[PDB]
Amino acid sequence: SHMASGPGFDFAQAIMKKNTVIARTEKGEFTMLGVYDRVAVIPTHASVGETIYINDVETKVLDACALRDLTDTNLEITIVKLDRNQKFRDIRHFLPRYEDDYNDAVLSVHTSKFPNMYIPVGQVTNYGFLNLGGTPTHRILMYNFPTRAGQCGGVVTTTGKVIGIHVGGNGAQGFAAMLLHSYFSD
Amino acid sequence: SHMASGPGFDFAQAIMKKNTVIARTEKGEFTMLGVYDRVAVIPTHASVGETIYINDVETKVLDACALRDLTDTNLEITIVKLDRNQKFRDIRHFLPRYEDDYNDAVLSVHTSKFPNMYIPVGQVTNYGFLNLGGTPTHRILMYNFPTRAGQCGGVVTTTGKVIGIHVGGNGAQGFAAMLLHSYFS
Numbered sequence A: 001s002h003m004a005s006g007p008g009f010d011f012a013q014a015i016m017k018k019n020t021v022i023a024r025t026e027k028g029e030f031t032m033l034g035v036y037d038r039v040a041v042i043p044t045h046a047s048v049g050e051t052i053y054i055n056d057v058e059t060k061v062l063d064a065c066a067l068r069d070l071t072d073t074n075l076e077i078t079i080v081k082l083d084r085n086q087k088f089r090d091i092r093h094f095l096p097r098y099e100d101d102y103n104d105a106v107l108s109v110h111t112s113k114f115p116n117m118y119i120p121v122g123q124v125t126n127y128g129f130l131n132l133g134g135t136p137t138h139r140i141l142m143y144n145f146p147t148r149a150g151q152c153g154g155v156v157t158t159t160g161k162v163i164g165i166h167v168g169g170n171g172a173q174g175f176a177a178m179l180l181h182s183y184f185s186d
Numbered sequence B: 001s002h003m004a005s006g007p008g009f010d011f012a013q014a015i016m017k018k019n020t021v022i023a024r025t026e027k028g029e030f031t032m033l034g035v036y037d038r039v040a041v042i043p044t045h046a047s048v049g050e051t052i053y054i055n056d057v058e059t060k061v062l063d064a065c066a067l068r069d070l071t072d073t074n075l076e077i078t079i080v081k082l083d084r085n086q087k088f089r090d091i092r093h094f095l096p097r098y099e100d101d102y103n104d105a106v107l108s109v110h111t112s113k114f115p116n117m118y119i120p121v122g123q124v125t126n127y128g129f130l131n132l133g134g135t136p137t138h139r140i141l142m143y144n145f146p147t148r149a150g151q152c153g154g155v156v157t158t159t160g161k162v163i164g165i166h167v168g169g170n171g172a173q174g175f176a177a178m179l180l181h182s183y184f185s
């Protein structure tokens, strides 16, 4: 069915090894992408509090911002600033500047149960609006793969671009929230 | 952590897309590797009967042979001949001819819940003998990855070599049965 490229697999591998951690909230375990310095991202439905477990180390959250567009609509991204010695590789230059469609993407998961899994998801479409668990959400990417709980937070990449994080699905399709350069560079 | 090469991921993807199906027995679902014609392999612990579900289509098993070496020891490979119109790409030339060690291997799964997932497992070592669920087993490959149930039948590959199928683990390590060219020729 779906296929990815060699450089695509190697690009995903480099992001996972250097820019992901296992995050655990009250709501469960999630893959977490670190973007730069001590700034990382996680789906809003994870309900981040004043503390979070990062690789099983409880870490103080210095700040969190649940992202909403100018229509005050959910984007399902929550940016968190972490009180933790280690800093992230700056990967902002891999973030897209515009909404777009993509071919042969890869979904990568980093949890305790699946500490290094890679899933080619195929063509990613700009789906736009989504009724996500009853919450209207915008800037959604869609792919036809039977995604599962525990893949939320998973990083979706193309060769050279980190395009989103997984946030939902219906049993036959997966949905990711867009990542955009403007969210982190202003 | 564990790492694989682009060519490694691309070879595994080609094997999965062309030479794997979802097999479901009374004992559960397993990844099933087709080797040539209508011949496929599955772990013996799947307890294959006279029928099997191949991609949710009940298929008549024409023959099955649970492999044991010349010491009459379990190998955990079962070769099945399937009553199935479509035939498999012959990939016998990718099978190793002898026991060996491998680097930066990949474990690939094709089940209903995880249809085509890829896991770098790192260095694969010829472990040899294993007491698998109380059954003495030979020709076992070992890799340090926390494998799980539902990854049994998963194909272990390196670029150009189909080296084994997953059959067990202990929570910190995974174990696969060797595949050898002599089994099919």
Ligand SMILES: *[C@@H](CC(=O)OCC)[C@H](C[C@@H]1CCNC1=O)NC(=O)[C@@H](CC(=O)[C@@H](NC(=O)c1cc(C)on1)C(C)C)Cc1ccc(F)cc1
Binding pocket: A027, A028, A045, A046, A076, A130, A131, A132, A133, A134, A135, A147, A148, A149, A150, A151, A152, A167, A168, A169, A170, A171, A173, A174, A175
């Ligand atoms: C991962 C996160 C999770 O499980 O909950 C965290 C506490 C999970 C992944 C999906 C599960 C099933 N397959 C997946 O990929 N995410 C969720 O469960 C979100 C809610 C959903 O995905 C719902 N699906 C839909 O709403 C939907 C809409 C369409 C067109 O198709 N499906 C569930 C019914 C599966 C978690 C979430 C996010 C934002 C919210 F406002 C509420 C809930």
Ligand SMILES: *[C@@H](CC(=O)OCC)[C@H](C[C@@H]1CCNC1=O)NC(=O)[C@@H](CC(=O)[C@@H](NC(=O)c1cc(C)on1)C(C)C)Cc1ccc(F)cc1
Binding pocket: B027, B028, B045, B076, B130, B131, B132, B133, B134, B135, B147, B148, B149, B150, B151, B152, B167, B168, B169, B170, B171, B173, B174, B175
């Ligand atoms: C895959 C098949 C399956 O789950 O269905 C069979 C009921 C599963 C994979 C392992 C599960 C846990 N993690 C895995 O990778 N395979 C099994 O459960 C076999 C038995 C085992 O793996 C045991 N482990 C050991 O024996 C062992 C030995 C050493 C040195 O380290 N671990 C369980 C304790 C997990 C299934 C099997 C195969 C052949 C038999 F004769 C009996 C049982």
